[PDB]
């Protein structure tokens, strides 16, 4: 995703609201996860946001700057999808680019015809085994935590 | 607090509200409460910027036509930061049914309006129970440590 | 209630909020409170439609960056209509200053979702004092009579 | 003004919210009043909404219908402008047009340089003599009402 | 159509984005073409934008100025509608009016019930036979550009 | 640049309005052109839209489908930028993709210090020589159309 930041995206200091960026982040996560969950022509479904991991906002973004939002599916469990989203600001006058934040989201597919039906998530192929292993450990961390 | 009716543009094709919609509302509540507090002792004029979102689980869906209720509370202050806990509740105004959608914790930092990116001191808060100050102090130390990776 | 920070698109070239912006927020509060009430006894599912806005004066300006606080109360019910009083207060979160922006009164009529333009019976509200019902009944009669010129 | 009504303009029933129409009405009033209060090259100003008269909503408007919003300055006092706004719905499939609402609004011009400075309003030309007298009577009745 | 230009319509300097005006232009074209294609109570339809002809932006528009959009159906073929749209900027503080844009659009009526069914366009009334001839030439010109 | 199509982007049939797409195309054109015109760190400028030409809408896009907007600078004259934009629709439930739109936009860099000052456009490198010649022919034809 690429969008010019507008006055209504920003506070009175002209700096973009956290909420504006969070919204864009989730939009990217929703597209990528829904596409994936339908990618093997299983039951028609839409991915629902189940969890947002801790995220830190490192640098401001200003009106007139371009928000760049990119997403990657980094893990899949039996019924869930982990998405990592990166947000970068670009000033197209000066050329300066800054990392706004990195967020991690967990999605769960729900049947279009039965909203209470959690679907199985198709596997992804990992470029690196360490990526599957790291993803598994993150999956475990949140599973264990939610087990109270 | 804050409430608003969920509209078509707030929801997916299933009729369920996008997480991003609720996240935006949560941050709107945090911004108001933290900005007010950071100017509450008439210090240098400032606006609270969102520094951190803690992990948060979405427990129940919300649908078009349901009312999102968003409430915020300042639960800790450090020298230069504000911790805010936000609760989101969905209300179906046809059936009456209310459900807890989400609980989220946020951290804000006040930045001067006049001095670009100047971090300001946060006025102290008073704790209903002193157990709460200690718990908040522990939460503060935990994020301070986690960020210094 | 409802609260929202005023944004540049809410305001004219001078930074002052448009009447239309506030009118919209007023009606949003009215729509929620009246719809909830009209479904509160689980009658035929319905949505409250705005029938009337009483005369209303805008007492003080609001500015970009101030927080609009909107609060509503059902003050009367007739057989098929709901009277709602709405208060709008501005809050400057930098200075702490609060001002009454506007008081408005609205009338809603519940319409069936299933049966188009079917007007439904409104559940009675509880009054703390008989005087409240009498005062509302007088306002109801006034507008009812006027709608015959 | 003429605008197609969209889903976000309407409730779950597909009927346009009163609030949406109210916002459009005020937009029409703001334009006509601001243009008028600058029409004699006085101090630059913007008209602010002072009063909305009682108004009844007669017929619903639906998603996909076209809202027609028309305004006319019907009276001016020394420092205020009376505006009548009509809203009509047009169904462009069926051809059917309906009167949604008629509203009267009062605006007061405020200096751009000084928000607290109320400016004098230029006179309007009345097509009929009786119209000025009618507007004058309404002005005095509301001015006398505002006592508290 | 008339609308005041707002901060979100414009860049950091306060000049209106072309996209904002393009959106307004298309809205006007969609209304006028849809009404016409349903004017004889044929199968219920909505006119879809098929083409924008070479449109030129002649002068900037600013926040606070009023955009005036006017549309006219200038030619009809068997299954399409040519619409010419004019955009005028009005500064309501100074009184200045400027021609912002002239655009020519082509619409095709599609059945509402029957997803992608192209319908016949009712013929338009011409004031002079010369107008039909000129329209025909423009019709043939766009046909040629499209066949390359 | 991706985004999901929402109810307010579309008509009563669920099909996206031409205006919605035109706005997205222009946003992409504005970003790429402004970035390019500041790429050699000349006088700070923003590129203003001057022309939209010969843009055709080939297939409908629906609510819930994802719009993919891709921009490319295809010609530069001394003071203007030609941008070609393609819009592709993607159904993330079915996987189906369709070419929605092909557009051509001309931008002109205007100094931020002097809003009437048309700046020089840095040259671009052409992947195939033939593209420059084709671009020049298009450029000459439109520049002469603004003469004859
Ligand atoms: C918030 C910000 C100003 C902090 O910058 P910094 O270099 O860390 O500033 P300092 O080192 O002086 O620290 C100031 C305070 O901020 C706190 N802080 C900084 N980052 C934090 C984070 N991610 N989470 C919680 N607190 C944080 C520090 O703990 C410190 O408070 P303390 O002294 O009471 O412990 C900076 O990270 C920033 O501008 N981020 C972007 C904010 C923003 O624009 N958000 C929306 C983006 S769309
Ligand atoms: C996501 C949701 C459907 C899960 O419900 P549930 O009763 O826990 O479902 P299950 O017990 O069958 O678990 C299904 C999967 O979801 C995962 N899950 C559930 N809650 C989760 C959370 N908070 N974070 C990460 N994963 C979660 C489970 O781990 C399981 O996947 P796995 O078997 O691969 O490990 C439910 O919490 C929900 O509807 N949440 C709201 C979603 C939404 O609408 N979001 C937007 C709100 S605005
Ligand atoms: C409108 C406003 C400037 C009037 O303030 P005031 O103290 O009464 O000012 P003045 O006494 O000098 O009156 C100026 C004119 O306004 C008129 N007026 C004041 N309140 C009015 C009302 N509510 N309805 C109609 N006219 C009104 C007066 O009659 C006078 O006109 P006149 O001399 O021709 O009779 C003030 O109430 C205000 O700023 N309101 C908020 C306007 C606004 O921002 N609207 C949008 C809110 S979101
Ligand atoms: C409100 C509406 C349904 C009433 O229609 P109606 O033909 O008068 O219906 P009824 O005669 O059966 O009257 C039903 C109730 O509505 C009330 N009513 C009707 N118009 C009213 C008005 N303008 N103000 C207050 N009450 C009104 C009647 O008093 C009656 O209540 P009661 O029996 O307790 O006295 C109708 O005027 C309408 O559909 N208006 C448009 C509503 C709308 O869509 N609003 C937004 C427009 S953008
Ligand atoms: C585009 C604009 C700057 C050109 O004005 P002008 O008086 O013709 O300026 P010039 O004669 O000096 O022409 C400068 C360049 O613009 C080009 N140009 C002007 N109009 C053009 C058009 N409609 N299409 C393509 N190129 C155009 C010229 O070809 C020239 O480039 P070149 O020297 O490489 O050939 C002017 O018409 C303008 O400000 N338009 C409005 C732009 C805007 O605000 N867009 C959004 C409106 S909502
Ligand atoms: C408009 C559309 C239905 C035409 O499809 P088609 O296969 O060419 O249909 P037909 O061959 O039956 O042609 C019907 C008419 O459309 C016209 N037409 C099609 N594309 C056109 C274009 N690019 N410019 C002008 N006219 C066009 C033809 O000239 C023909 O008119 P005629 O018979 O009077 O000469 C198709 O291109 C489409 O669905 N485009 C997208 C429309 C849309 O959804 N717009 C918004 C996109 S966000």
Percent in strands of chain A? 25-35%
The CATH architecture of chain A can be given as: Roll
Count every beta strand of chain A, where a strand is a DSSP E run of 2 or more residues.
6
What is the helix tally of chain A? Answer: 2
Oligomeric state as shown: homohexamer
| Rg of chain A, nearest Å | 17 Å
What's the CATH class of chain A, please? Alpha Beta
Please state the overall shape of chain A, judged from the principal axes of the Cα atoms: elongated
CATH superfamily heading of chain A:
Hotdog Thioesterase
Distance from N terminus to C terminus of chain A (CA atoms, Å) equals 36 Å
- Percent in helix of chain A: 25-40%
Largest interface: A-B, 36 and 35 residues
Structurally, the number of domains of chain A stands at 1
- What hetero molecules are bound to the protein chains? coenzyme A
Main sheet record of chain A? 5 strands, antiparallel
Strand order of the biggest β-sheet of chain A = 1-4-5-6-2
Order of helices and strands of chain A: EHEEEEEH
Subunit structure (chains A, D, E, F): Homohexamer.
Domain HotDog ACOT-type (chains A, D, E, F): 3-113
Protein name (chains A, D, E, F): Cytosolic acyl coenzyme A thioester hydrolase
Organism (chains A, D, E, F): Mus musculus
Structural account:
The PDB classes it as hydrolase. Keywords: acyl-COA thioesterase 7, serine esterase, protein structure, domain duplication, acot7, hotdog domain. The assembly is hexameric. Six copies of one chain form a homohexamer. The first copy, chain A, is of the alpha+beta class and 148 residues long. Chain A has one domain: Hotdog Thioesterase (Thiol Ester Dehydrase, Chain A, Roll). Chain A contains two helices and six strands; from the N terminus they run E-H-E-E-E-E-E-H. The radius of gyration of chain A is 17 Å and the shape is elongated. One coenzyme A sits between chains E (48-51, 77-80, 106, 108, 118, 142, 146) and F (15-16, 18, 21, 56-61, 100). One coenzyme A sits between chains B (49-52, 78-81, 107, 109, 111, 117, 119, 143-144, 147) and A (15-16, 18, 21, 56-61, 100).
């Amino acid at each position: 995703a690429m969008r010019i930041m507008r006055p209504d995206d920003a506070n009175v200091a002209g700096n973009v609201h956290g909420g504006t960026i969070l919204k864009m982040i989730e939009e990217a996560g929703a597209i990528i996860s829904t596409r994936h969950c339908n990618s093997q022509n299983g039951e028609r479904c839409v991915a629902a946001l189940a969890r947002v991991e801790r995220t830190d906002f490192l640098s401001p973004m200003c009106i007139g700057e371009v928000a760049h939002v990119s997403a990657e599916i980094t893990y899949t469990s039996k019924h869930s999808v982990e998405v990592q989203v990166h947000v970068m600001s670009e000033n197209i006058l000066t050329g300066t680019k800054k990392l706004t934040n990195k967020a991690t989201l967990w999605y769960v597919p729900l049947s279009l015809k039965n909203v209470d039906k959690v679907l199985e998530v198709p596997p992804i192929v990992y470029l690196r085994q360490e990526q599957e292993e790291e993803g598994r450990k993150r999956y475990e961390a949140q599973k264990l935590e939610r087990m109270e």
